[PDB]
Amino acid sequence: AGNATEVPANSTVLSFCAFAVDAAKAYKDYLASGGQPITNCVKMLCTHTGTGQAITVTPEANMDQESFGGASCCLYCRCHIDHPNPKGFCDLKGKYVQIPTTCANDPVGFTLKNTVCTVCGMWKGYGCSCD
Amino acid sequence: ENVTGLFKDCSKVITGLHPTQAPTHLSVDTKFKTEGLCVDIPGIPKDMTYRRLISMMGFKMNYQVNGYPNMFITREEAIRHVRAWIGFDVEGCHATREAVGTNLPLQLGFSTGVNLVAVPTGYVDTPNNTDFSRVSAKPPPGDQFKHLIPLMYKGLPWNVVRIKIVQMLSDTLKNLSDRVVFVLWAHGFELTSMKYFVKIGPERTCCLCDRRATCFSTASDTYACWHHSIGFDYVYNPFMIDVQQWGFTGNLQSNHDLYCQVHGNAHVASCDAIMTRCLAVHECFVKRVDWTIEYPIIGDELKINAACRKVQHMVVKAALLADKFPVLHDIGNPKAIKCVPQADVEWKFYDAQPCSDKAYKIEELFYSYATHSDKFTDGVCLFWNCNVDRYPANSIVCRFDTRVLSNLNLPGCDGGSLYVNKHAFHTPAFDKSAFVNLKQLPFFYYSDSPCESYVPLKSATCITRCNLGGAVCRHHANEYRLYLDAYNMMISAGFSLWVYKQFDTYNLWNTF
RNA sequence: AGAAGCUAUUAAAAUCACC
RNA sequence: AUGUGAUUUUAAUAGCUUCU
Ligand SMILES: [Ca+2]
Ligand SMILES: [Ca+2]
Ligand SMILES: [Zn+2]
Ligand SMILES: [Zn+2]
Ligand SMILES: [Zn+2]
Ligand SMILES: [Zn+2]
Ligand SMILES: [Zn+2]
């Protein structure tokens, strides 16, 4: 009964991150000390020619980016614990996420450390031009 | 294959999930999955009202991170923490309506003796969050499980059975240790039942204190030691251990019931966690006491041992000088340490096994009543801390009375108990049938020290030439009170002295 | 077209633990 | 209208290789 979701390569990182008082810090510490990133992320076959935005309802991917499904990059959605966002609503789940392709082998570790520029909707420092 | 039972979606909806709001690639439906890379079909919209019971079954805590302690431990690090063993067994209920495929925890039980029923509660993955909430459940089928039929009509929500696990653990392990070693038999459903009340994290220290931080508080994001955890709900770093990976083949009640005939009533949680701790005390301590593993000093460890050494030094010399035994045997004395060196008896060391030295030619012999009932007839045999079923008619026995409960005397296998004081002694059950050839010992103090020159004390128990006269000297009154303090603190600690039939306290008087 | 061997996909049964 | 698994078997379905 049921349709399996995980692979045994991600179990050792899912279990350890399932128990944590702070889910963001524990993934970074797993990544630093001999840790393989979370595999099996959801990836979108976009036209890969589109205007860049971090979070969109339809995948808008620039040529230097890869658009992932926003439920497989939010670590808190991904371990089934409660989001630390106020109103307890995930921002990323439901919308299509975007991750720069130089660091898109590990999406979850991109969405934990980086942030979205409020005035132009781009990833701050990764093409955000707010000088 | 390369699949795992972890986070296995247990809904009965035929369709899958949208490309977004799906946790992994294997959970997306077939309509979107093309060459391992999902496509956004703009025609099919996403679900906005749906509930899927995620199955938290199959956790594997084999991680290795630098600052984070490991949950599972090796059995040379669980014998060093034996004051912090709390058995754990969880009886589950299956989800029957609108979700099938996971065993939600129903009944938690500990070695303390406290059953905590919980409502069936699972991780329902809503559109916007993971809604930890009540799911519908049925108790297991069969006449093997019929005492879980009423329990699903009672229980508490998981925000009161998270605080009655940290109000019970904190009252049990307040004085034993500063960590907790959850002795589990399964290694599966227990871990599944530890998603609910355990949060591992980096090694922390108690707020406004100094002890290890073992209790988390989700309301106020702080940590506590076992003394200050009033109202704190999440257990911080526990340690666990799996007994089935020690080479056991078979059921629990067919491996406990070969060693113990006191526990019973299996498949109740408090009687699965009692058998699980009973068997794990057996598999580590009943073989022989291990003299290499020292233990911390909880309290009164220095005074009790020195008082025992004082009274054992006293009673042997009194019985030897009073009855003039030609030879004195010894049993169970691991080293060769002469208790009374200024004696005339020949100390034949009939040890149980040779322990790390043959410099004194300690003999090897095991004792049983029906075997050696007529082997030792000469003299007296000092069974200090021996564990034989029955003692012969000439002995000086000191047996630990295993019915007294204290912070020293942890409960143990077959009604006998584990007396962990600077070493671990697994003393067997204290039965009266062992002492049918012996009697109790009166209280008395005897010394050959000459009297030197305050409340006057008149007691016929003290055996000195000063108290035989009218005036009791001050060079013996403090001796008598110190000896009385040592004797009463020892008897309160739980030992029990026994002596042979012909012990006469008046034979000591004519020696003067 | 079949056979033989190896790895995998699904289904049924057996044994074992947990419930 | 099927409780978790693990290990064996036994059937079929895919490949990969060899032979006839
Ligand atoms: Ca169990
Ligand atoms: Ca059980
Ligand atoms: Zn999220
Ligand atoms: Zn910007
Ligand atoms: Zn404290
Ligand atoms: Zn038992
Ligand atoms: Zn005196």
Residue numbers in the entry:
A (entry chain A): 1 to 131
B (entry chain B): 2 to 454, 465 to 523
From the paper:
Nsp14 is a bifunctional enzyme that harbors both 3′-to-5′ ExoN and mRNA cap guanine-N7 methyltransferase (N7-MTase) activities. The N-terminal ExoN domain of nsp14 improves RNA synthesis fidelity by removing misincorporated nucleotides or nucleotide analogs from the nascent RNA, whereas the C-terminal N7-MTase domain is involved in the 5′ capping processes of the viral genomic and subgenomic mRNAs. The ExoN activity of nsp14 is stimulated by nsp10, which binds to the ExoN domain and helps stabilize the architecture of the ExoN active site. However, the efficacy of nucleotide analog inhibitors on coronavirus RdRp is compromised by the presence of the viral nsp14 exoribonuclease (ExoN), an RNA proofreader that is specific to coronaviruses and a few other closely related virus families of the Nidovirales order and crucial to maintain the integrity of their unusually large RNA genome.
